[model samples]
Structures are given as C-alpha cells and as structure tokens.
Target chain A: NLYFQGIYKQFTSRTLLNFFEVAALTDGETNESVAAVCKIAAKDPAIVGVSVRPAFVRFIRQELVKSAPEVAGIKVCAAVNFPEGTGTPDTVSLEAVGALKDGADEIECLIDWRRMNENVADGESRIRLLVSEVKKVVGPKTLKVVLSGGELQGGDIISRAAVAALEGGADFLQTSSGLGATHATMFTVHLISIALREYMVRENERIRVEGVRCIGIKIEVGDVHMAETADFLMQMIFENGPRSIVRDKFRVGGGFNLLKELRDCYESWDSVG
Target chain B: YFQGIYKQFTSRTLLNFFEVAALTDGETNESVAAVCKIAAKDPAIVGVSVRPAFVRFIRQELVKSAPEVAGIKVCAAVNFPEGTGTPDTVSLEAVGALKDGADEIECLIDWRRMNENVADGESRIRLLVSEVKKVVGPKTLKVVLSGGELQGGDIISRAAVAALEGGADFLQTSSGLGATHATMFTVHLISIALREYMVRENERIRVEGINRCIGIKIEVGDVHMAETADFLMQMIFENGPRSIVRDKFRVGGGFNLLKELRDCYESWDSVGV
Candidate 1:
C-alpha cells in the first residue's frame, strides 16, 4: 500500500544499482545494459537514473551519450568506492570526480563504516570529510552518503552517520551498500527514520545553511527479492514519519526487479480499483 | 615440538595466515596486544594484515617492536573495498603501511573496470600496482579482484590477465565476504590464467621480480578454511604440496580460523589425494 502512496510517481524513479552479484556484467554486457536501460528509461517518466560504475559512465559518455541524446532526461548515478568504503577523503573525491567527468547526475558515496565502529566523533568526522569532498566536486548533482549499515554495529553509529552525512552537505543518507555485512532492515529503517527526525530538528540552524532542512533517507534492499520486501520497507518508512518522503529524496536502491515484482503483487487491487 | 612439525616448518610448505577483522577500536585493544604476543612466539603466523588505522593503537605498537611482525610478514590493504584509487594517494597509503612494517599489501582492484577494459581503468590499476611495488620492493602484492561480483570463467580469465599486467603477485578471489569465496569454478579459472601467465611471461607486464607462477591465496576462515584449503591445495600445487611461503601461497583470516587450517595442513594424508 505504501508503494503507491502520494509519492508513487517519484517512487518509481529510484536509482537501480549495477553492482548486484547476479547481475554482474562485463564491458560488453554493461555497455548494452546501460545504453538499453537508458534508452528505455527515456520513454518512461517512472524510471529515473541507472546507477553504474564510473568507468561504465565513461563508457556511456564516450560511446552512447551522443547516440542516445534523447535519454538525457534520465539521471546517471555513480557509486563511489562502495560496499567496502576503504579510502581517504581525497581518494574518495578522486573517484567521484571520475564519475563527474563522465556526466554523473548523482553520486552515492559509501562512508568508511569502520571509522564509526572505532569512535563516534572520529567516525562522523570521517563521514563529514567524505561528504564535504564529494559535495564540492558534485556541484548541483545529488550527493547521497551510504552509511554501509551492515558494517556498523549499533543504533548510535547509524544516527551519528545520519547527522554527519547531512551536516556535510549530502542530500540523502542511504541505509547500506546492499552488499555489506548487512542490508536494509525494518529496524535500521526505523532507526534512521527517527534519527533523521531528531537530527533535522536538532541541527536545523546549520541544516538550513546548506538549504537542506528536509533531509532524505533511501533504503537499500538485498537478498529478499520478493515484492513484499519492498512494500514492507516502504510501510515502515512511511509510518516512521519523515514529513516528505519524495523522489527528490527518498529511494530504494539495489533491487530494481523488485519494483516490477511489487507492482505485480499489487496488480489485483489496482485492476479492481 | 609436534611430530613432523619441524620438517613442515623447515620446508615452510605449510605457512600461517593471520587476519585482524576483530581488532576494532574499542573492544579489541587487548586482543590485538594478545595476538601480537601470540604471533611472536608462534612461527605459525607467517603474516598478518591489521587495520592500518588500528595498527598504531595496539598496546605494543606491534609493527614497531613485535618480533612477530618483523620476523614474519605484515600485510595491509590500500584503497581497498573498491580499489579505484589513483597512484598518488594509493602509493602514499602503501608507503605509509610499509613504514608501519607491512611487508605485503592486498588491494581490492576495480574488477569491474578490468572487466570493461577501460584504458584509463587499466592505467589506474597498473599505476596502483607499479607504485606500490616501487616501495614494498620484493614484498608480496595481493590484488583482490572480487569473484563474487565477477561473472563467468571467460571474464575471470580476462581479469587475471589485467591483474597480472598491473603487477599482481597473488590473484585473490573475493574479500571472502560476498560469495562463498573462491569456489571451485572461480579458482580453477584463475589457476588456468596464472598457469598461462607463468608460461607466457610478458616481461613488460612484470613490474617487480615476481617471476614465479603467481601464488593462489584464498581468503578463508572457520571450518571451511580447512575444507577449502584441502580442495584448493591439491588444485593449486601439482607436486602434491610445495613449501608454503607468503609469496607462493597463504590463507588469510583471523588467528583461530588459521589455527584450524594449520592443524588441517599437519594432518593431511599425502598418499591419498
């Protein structure tokens, strides 16, 4: 039910990641996959961006962008040093710029969760450091900080990550890399939803400085591919109360196939209506 | 000592594998110190790669004084998780690890790029390897081109070529996290590739003096560590078993996991394959 809430149109425009273990593609496969996905996306307003690796974006920019100019409306997202989040801020930034050079519309950078596991202050500082560096290079492009939830231990670490990502100029904070030690759980979604609620109010003064009072949360799903998994997460976030969980902000990454599966799961009710 | 232990130790065909995943910031301070002490007396631990950031805080500063770290080898990760770092930053990290007494560096290469065959991607990989080799000298270089995300034997073969071209001494399967890790299929393909590279020795691709057949190191632990080692040992070594050394082979994980493997090695039936 939450899947087709008020934000149905925006919800359909979620970023589908190309980093799945099953969907692993070579250059040739990725070349065709990315271009075909982009072209198909051009015809549909529901499909937003196709998130790909930086080199693939370079491939798209060099080989496909000219031929598929009509697909410009679709966004291109790059996952910078994802899943593991092992690099210095500059290293993270360098790879980010590589994505930008290839015409990325958004950058989802994975924060070193191990940093958080060490110390809250130090970890958030590292999060802020990556956020600032990526934001600087990102310009107007969307910058989402991936918390790498599976790597983190407790609720406090996730909250600290949530606040720091927003403070450092991120438009959104994602639950996990979808392939980390953990995936987005209902518990994590609720933890971060409430954290976003609290942090937005507590950090309002500084949050407005960056013009981001309305922080966003994106849930990443892995393993459980059933339609219920998507709807269940949507319901959890919807009830958690984020004010405006829209396309410009909230997203569900990694399982693009689930979206269609979810729609099928809800088709009976839709037909009757 | 244990029966036949001296012979195996002298031959060194069965070496120790050490991992520092549990040595986090708050909880494992004592454990790291204890392990450093354990590694010192036990010749079983041939090499250890702790968290670079956490390495300094260990009680004894193991890298500085632990006879274990010096007597044995120490490995660290540079631009890990998604090894997409440039030469400048990655080299700096690599050099710092070396100064900290790390003799081996396991880097997670952007296997996706190598899969796609980007000239720039290939250059970055080459630069990362070449630069680190310049500093570590004859030390080990293990490039983790993750098998979990990599598809098919054909791509694995191509990836092996690129990894060697970029100066990898050991071609590891995964971070030992994502998939079951170095499955029979994955290891077989990588071995064939290494066997090919060994025979076809392109001097131009060989940056350092890593002139032997590239070592096949699998990152494993727990009961499966020994199980995989049993299967992999026979697959990797043709002479039943060769004297194990860091350069030629290793099993990387925590000490307890490695302990089981060591036991497996000492008890293996040579006649019965």
Candidate 2:
C-alpha cells in the first residue's frame, strides 16, 4: 500500500497536505459548492488551494472573504481556455488577465494543443505569445500552462510541448485540464517531468546560472483520486529531481471526494507514524 | 441515484440508450482505445463519440476487436463545446470526420449567432445544417444546442426547430463542457419541441395524402448515472410513447454508467432484491 514511500521516505502526511488542492471545474458548479469548498479550505490545511473556471474566480474570491474570512488568504487558481483549448491565443490571454484582475492568485491557461498538434511551430509561437502576454499581467502569480496530454499524443509531442511552454515563461507545466476523456495519466506526467528535467539541465549548463526558477508539476487533472495515486505522483516528481515536495514544487487537484479520501489517508498514516 | 432503480422496476425494462464519449481535447488514442475495448464487450453500448482525429481509430479498434456491439457507430463532433466556427470551417470538419469513417456527426449550433436575432439564427443554423447535411446525405446528423448559453425554453425550442428544419436527425443538449450540464428543464423543452415538430411535419405530409411520421431523436449529454437517465426518460415519456422514447432517445456521456448498468442487469437474474 505504501510502496511509493520506499523510494521517497520524506513522503509524510504534512507533505501530502501541502501538495493537495481541491478543484471544482465542471460547468455545473454553483455558489453553494464554491462556498462549501471555501469552508473546508478555511478549516483544513489539507486543502492548499481551490481551483475554478474564469467565470467563478470573482465569486470564489469574494466568497472566501465574505463567508470564510479565515481562509481569505487561501490561493484561488483560475483556469482559462480551460478543458477546451480551442480559443484564440489572444482570447485565452484576455481570459487569464481578466481572471487575475478579478482577484485570482494563480492562472492555469490551456495551450492550444489542438492547433499545436496541427502545426507545431505555429502552436508553439502562439503559446509563447499567450504566455508572454499574460506573464506581463501575471507578475509574481503562478502561471501553469496545460499541455493537455489527452489532445497531444506521443511522448515526443508531450515533451516537445512542455519545453515550448517553458520557453514561453510558464512557471508550471500541467498535465491536463481534467475535463476531457483522457486526463493526467502516469505516462503524461512522466513525459512532462522528463522535459522539465532536461530543460533545467540545459539552462543551468548554458549559463552556469544559480537560482533559476524551479518549474513545478500539477497532477490529478481528472482521476488521480486516491492517496495511492498521489503517492505515485510524488514519487514521479522526486525521481525527476524535485527532492522537496512543497506547495509550489508540486500540486494535486481533484474533486471534494478525492480531497476527502486523501485527507482520510493522511490522517490514518499520520496517526500511525 | 437509486430512483432509477425504482423506475426500472415499474417500467420493466431499461432505457435503450448509450453513447460512450471520449470527445474531450484531453482524450488520447490510448484513452479512446480503452473505451473501444470496453465498448467492444458490451452490446448495450450504442456508439462511441470522439474527436474528428480519432474517428478512424475508434472504427479500426471496433473492427480489430470485432465488437459484440453491432452497428457501433463512430460519432464525430464538429466545433464541439464552442460552436463559433464559420459554416465553411464546420463543414470541412464534418467532411473530414465522414471521410475518416464516422457514421454520425454532432455539430454544435452557433448559439451566439442565434442569440443576436432569432430569424437570423434560425436561417444560419438552417444553412449550416443543410451544408453539412448535403455532404452527410443519409448519415445521421445531430446538432447540439448549448442549453446553458441559450437559456429560456423559447430560445432552446427555436434552436431545436431550426436544427430539425435544417435536416438534422437528432437534437442534443449541452456538450457537457458548457456552464451547465443537461438539466431536466432543458431536455423537457427540447423534447416538446421535437414532438411538436413531428406532428406538424406529419400533418403537412397527410395533406398530400401520403401518410408518414418523421422521426427525430433527442440526445442528452452529461448523463453520468442510471438515476439521471431514468429521470430524463420520465420527462420524455410524458411527451410521447415509450416506443418513441426507446427508438428516438439517446444518452451521451455514460461510459462509466454502462458498467454499473450491466452489473444491475446481471444481478437482476442471479440476485433478486
């Protein structure tokens, strides 16, 4: 049950809590649901952050302060161009900027993976342009580019997109938007980590630079629900050279049921340890 | 969720509907292949809804596995969750899917255009549907109306009529990627529109002394479980005969529900509860 821990002994309950994020991105989300998530974030340390679509950023940000004032400091991540990355780059950029303007602390913008799949060069340039545009407004807020594994097939394609997204100034490389048929699989996360590691190695070697920003990984786009899956993601990231798993270093987002399951697993293990 | 079980006992039969979807941008070939693997074993599955890119893959997998699910049509969605593509762009997408072996095409209606002006929206949809229909010929064509965006029964009904008039074989609810999933109210309005359209068409044909009924189906999206399916079925039942509900109703986004439904059917024989 705890096989992943054998490789990374630092995979403790506190680390798991710091890494977990509760997300409700479905179109059916309501004010009641958002408030409930905020209430949990207010009380529980396991809920590091709550993610939502662009439309709900203001509502969630406002609710955090209004109803759950204790958790007003909780980070709110907004997903733009979202599960479907079909919007024009300008449109996605505007969506990201709007979310930030509405008080979102993080922006997870989807790369136009479909267009990128059609033409790699055009898509990469679009990603760079969109990322660059939003980066200006994003300032110090985290910006995670969704290199949707579901749309971009093959290890080569995924890794290529990861590198492109990094070049475009993405602070984090996300596996999927989690609204699709296939979301953040082990294979996809592996490919992205490989790209991130290689890029970091090359960047450090080229400039002999110190203190380069460490890119992060966000898993559980769709079905990484159990602690077992979370453990696997942590191991994957550790193997890729991010030895310390912190909130900024790694994140796992899913539905409330998934968050609760992970919390239960954390409590059980924390009690035993 | 257990309500569907009660309705099943009274009706004495399960709804003859199932459309497994792997239509998100995040979906990959492996994911679609997995869907094909399961669908190959279940004869109850009606078809697999996929992106235009994987229409051929699903068709090929069905052939390779020699699926028990006969007439396992491959449905390709055009313009998908966002139906803002021009008529020409959408037509090309429809043609590409058809060329790739899709037996059915699900096009998203340009609701934004319709919202501007009802007459313009109706004519534009009519032209768009007709263009795709011209290429589709005898193949099935379903047009999706974003129920969430096109709120109000009047607008949804108008869009439904426009699609039907444009020769669409089916009218679908939201794409499950919209701000709202398939609600009972949305489906009710669309079903009533379909019933009224059928009656009107029949009267015109009867006036020419050629007695006939035009059969148009309703496809509901985001029906994740048997309970929701049964609830929607009840709504359809109030509008028409159970035969029409069986023959003309379609359920989309039910891949997970299929396994539970099969289990329910199996238990009905071995464990009476």
Candidate 3:
C-alpha cells in the first residue's frame, strides 16, 4: 500500500512497446508482438505507441493498422537508421519515406552523429540537413531524433547535441539506444533538461516549456530495476528544470518488462484507490 | 586519442571495451556492413561488443571485412546492470551469445547479491561463469561486479576474489552503469585482488604443469575518454606492482574512442604521464 502511494503520483505509463529482437528474431514473432502491442494500445487512454526497426516498419504497421483500427491515437513510430544514423542523405530520406508510407505516424530517426564531432571528416554534419529534408516529406508527422548520448561525447556535449537537435527542428530528442549499459544517466538527462530550458529561453518558441514544448525529451534506458532509479531519472528532468518540464513532453523508453513493472505498480495504486 | 597511430597495431596496450551499440534495435544488411567497415578502419581496437541480437551480424561482417587482419574480438554482455537470473537460464543465454559469434563474454555479477554478501553471491556468479567458461572453454570470461555502485575497498576486493574463484579470466572494476566510472581507489583494490588471485591460480597451474594468466579490466562509463586510459595506465603503475602489461590489464569503451587514445598514447609516450 505504501509502495503504491509512492508510485501513484509519478508512475504513469504508455501502451504499445515492443522489445527484444525488434525485428525478425523468433520465427515470425515480430508481427505477433506488434499485434499484442496493439491490443494494449486499444485498451489504454491517450494511446501511446510502439517503436520498431526500420525493416520491420511495414510489417508492424500492417498489424497495428489492421488489428487496432478502432483505437484512437494508435501511432506507429518506426525507427530509421537506428542506434547509428549512418544512412546517407539519400538512404535516410528513402527510409523515412518508406516507413511513413507504411503508415508510420512518426519517424524516430537516428541522426548521423559523426557530424557532431568537429574533427570528423568525409562524413559531414548532415543531421540538421537530413531532418530538414525528411520534414519536407513528412509534413505534420513528428520527427524524433534518437541520440546515443552514451556513445557520443560525454555529458556536456550531449547537452549541446540536444540544443543542436532542437535548433534542427526535432519534435523529440530521445537519449540512449536502449541497448547496452550505455542508457541515459541522471547526469546526462539533467544536462539535457538544462539545455532544453536554455534553448526555449533563447528562441522564444511558441510552445510550452514544460508541456507542449518546441522540442520534447525522451530517454531510452535499457532497464530500470529499481523504483528509485526510475524516480531519480524522472526527478532529474521533471524536478531539475521548470516544473513538469518533462511531465507531458517526455517519454521514458523502457522494454516490455519495464511496462509490466509499471503496470503492476499502477494496479496496486488502483486497488488502494 | 587513438587514430592514425596504428601501422596497424602499435604500442603495448590491451585495448578492450563493450561498445553499447546503435545496432541494438536490429541490424539491416547496410547497418551490418557499415559497422564492419568502420571496425576495419581501426586496428588499435582489439575488442568490440553489441547487443546479442546483432552479434552474429556484426561478427560475420567484421570477420569478412577484416578477415583476421584487424584482430578485434567480439563480446556480448548478459544479465547486465542487475545480473539477476537463474543459473541455467543465464548460462544458456550466454552460450547463445557465443554461438552468435561473441569472442568473449562480459557478464554482470549481481551487484545486490555482492553488496548484501548473499550466501550464493559468488556461487551464482560462479555458475554463470563456469557454465559460460565451460562452453567458451578457451575464449575469455570477464565478470563485471558494478564496482562503481559499490563502496569501500574490502567489498570491492571481495568481489574480485569471488569473480576470480568463479572462473573469470578477468575481474572488472565497473559495470559502467552506476554514478562513478572505474575509480582509481577501486581499481587499486582490484589490482591487489588480481595479484593475490594470480598467486593462487598460477600456483595451481604450476602444480598441474599448465601455464596461464588472468588480469584486471577497468570499464568506468560507457563513453570512451582518452584521459581515463592514461589515468588508468598511470594508476596501475603507481599504486600496484608490475608495469601495465597487456596480459595484466585491459580498458573498455567504444572502438571509435581510440582517436583520443591514439594521440594520447603517442603524446604521453613523448612526455611520460
């Protein structure tokens, strides 16, 4: 009961998350997984969505659209050039267009990070250029940039990267690839929150700094085994910056296991209620 | 710190790091090819890692592109961050990574168990290690006990003893998960533990007329920094016995991290760190 008290106020979760081999790992399980995710989407309010590997976009799209036709806000987010956004300008656009064509409501793209490094040669800074190009085709659809701050330069540069992303017109800046122990740390998330606050102040963007922001923030940590860790990260972005800076504008990227954990926490809260 | 200095391999450093991937979502042919090609460009990198999903894709392409010329070992981390799993299940999953083409394994040693001084702390870790080492038989086994989360030298030293007794070829100082990177104070405890373990292990091998060696690996954070490498190399030489030999020590991060290390290795060699 006491645990529920701690979780009730802060433990909000979204439906529709697909984990593990994200693509075709188990013999034909990806489609089934996406379908199951749709069932959750059909049930939940506000109707959050699933992210998948680019190759499987069309497949995941088919299932979500076909199976959950009645679910409002059943968005399909297909990640393109994921984990590493090394696709050329042409490939990036092609993938973005293809995923969108497959009925993806949003394109969660990995921006080619080599551009962020000043010394990087041959591979130029094409992230902003890439996003701008994709937005032309994407129109009103959201373009979320997934940055692996763990692999990028340390904390400070990641904050700078977040600023660059906002300037480039990213709808969301998601940290970590949710793969390794390299998931977002509190320190990195705090820096990004600071950066997010600073960016809004500089641009005077016609968006809520805390809620309907110009650039939303998402952190894809691999797993959070402890409630403290979850609360710690949420506190960093939610508490450190402007009040509720991350409340509506942030998505905490966790696996299905994490979904289950939060679900159990919520069920407990409801029982006490 | 480690670019341009390879001809292709220079200096006497044991380079190793589990590069948490951008390929975590899943790998396409293009993504796989790009990872291999980038890997082929660097010879200073001796080990790389990925999510188990992309291990096969990366390893096959890495071998094809470099063809034993680049000489980088592939690794997979299992039961990461928390390291909680049934022995049978953990062992089976680890074998899966190896079969997928992992040259080495970095397995988490339940940090809570280590912290609580649980009855099965070492035994559980030993089971995972022995089963993996039994399957791997000859590759390499590194136990990451999350030293960054751990405090005090005694517990860190005890963790070293447990992991070594459990049959790890290397005892690492950090899981790159917690607040701190591999601390100098902690690394020293690990070094002392390594010296003691080597004494026992080498004696056992001597009696059996078998010769072998094991070492200490330091992986603090996910980001690969040049300063940490020299700081570690200097720390190893200053506080502990013996020079920083390849057989005795290794570092962990991304291979692309070598740019700073390459230059620093050269720059520091010019004026001793």
- Reproduced native contacts, each prediction: 0.00, 0.00, 0.00
Rank by TM-score (best first): 2, 3, 1
Error of 1 at B72 (Å): 73
Error of 2 at B116 (Å): 90
**Per-residue lDDT tens digits of candidate 2, residues B153-245?**
788999999989888887878775565657667777777788888888888888988741223333444443443534443443445333333
Q: Which ten contiguous residues of candidate 3 chain A have the minimum total lDDT?
A: A14-23
Q: How accurately is candidate 2 docked according to DockQ?
A: 0.01
**What TM-score would every model get versus the actual structure?**
0.42, 0.46, 0.42
lDDT agreement with native, every candidate: 0.60, 0.68, 0.58
Docking class of 2: incorrect
- The TM-score of predicted model 1 comes to 0.42
> Tens digits of per-residue lDDT for model 3 on B65-97?
557524656777776646787667677777899
Compute DockQ for each candidate against the true complex.
Answer: 0.01, 0.01, 0.01
Which pairs, if any, clash in model 2? A150-B26
Tens-place lDDT digits, model 1, residues B88-192: 777788887777666678777676776676555556567677777677678778887677676566766766677788788888776644444656667667777
Runs with alpha carbons beyond 4 Å of true place in candidate 2: A1-14, A206-211, A267-273, B1-273
Candidate 1: how close is chain B to the reference, as a TM-score? Answer: 0.73
TM-score of chain B of each: 0.73, 0.85, 0.75
How many Å off is the CA of B47 in candidate 2? 60
